[PDB]
Amino acid sequence: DELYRQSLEIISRYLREQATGAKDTKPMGRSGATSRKALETLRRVGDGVQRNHETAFQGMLRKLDIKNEDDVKSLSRVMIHVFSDGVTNWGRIVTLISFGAFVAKHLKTINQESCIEPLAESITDVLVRTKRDWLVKQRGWDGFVEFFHV
Numbered sequence: 207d208e209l210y211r212q213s214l215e216i217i218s219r220y221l222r223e224q225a226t227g228a229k230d231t232k233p234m235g236r237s238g239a240t241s242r243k244a245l246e247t248l249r250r251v252g253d254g255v256q257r258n259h260e261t262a263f264q265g266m267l268r269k270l271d272i273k274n275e276d277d278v279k280s281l282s283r284v285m286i287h288v289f290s291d292g293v294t295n296w297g298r299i300v301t302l303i304s305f306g307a308f309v310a311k312h313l314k315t316i317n318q319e320s321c322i323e324p325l326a327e328s329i330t331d332v333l334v335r336t337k338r339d340w341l342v343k344q345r346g347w348d349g350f351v352e353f354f355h356v
């Protein structure tokens with residue numbers, strides 16, 4: 207699943223950078239240029255989204271009450287329930303990923319770094335399984351890079 211593979215590379219690298227500050231030096235494989243451009247886009251748009259939505263993000267994080275792996279595993283059902291309905295737009299997708307980065311920072315703060323990769327996998331899974339049709343129409347990560355280009 208090329209779209210899952212590419213989406214996971216971008217989302218897991220962003221969530222790891224945000225939580226730990228470390229940069230992945232490993233090559234990204236197929237559609238690497240677009241993946242690197244999408245990750246660069248997330249660094250700029252994602253930082254500002256977390257600052258802009260800080261109050262609601264703090265509130266949503268507190269209600270989810272994530273403290274371990276078992277709490278992370280139960281997030282997939284929550285994301286599927288909220289993200290499946292309503293109109294999709296790039297704003298909604300970047301804010302889903304930016305909230306994932308906000309939760310990843312919380313996971314590092316509580317010394318649960320081992321939960322960051324399962325969280326990135328769970329976000330990617332919900333994005334691709336619920337929005338593949340819309341992502342095909344919008345040209346996937348090429349569409350994402352173009353939409354937020356400045």
Ligand SMILES: O=C(O)c1cc(SCCc2ccccc2)ccc1NS(=O)(=O)N1CCN(Cc2ccc(F)cc2)CC1
Binds near residue numbers: 266284
């Ligand atoms: O786009 C929507 O339909 C939307 C719906 C709501 S109604 C309340 C649902 C809720 C969520 C969390 C805790 C409690 C309740 C609130 C905000 C919304 N937009 S969003 O762009 O900010 N957003 C951020 C939160 N994503 C879910 C998520 C959960 C864990 C995670 F690691 C990453 C993402 C959904 C998309």
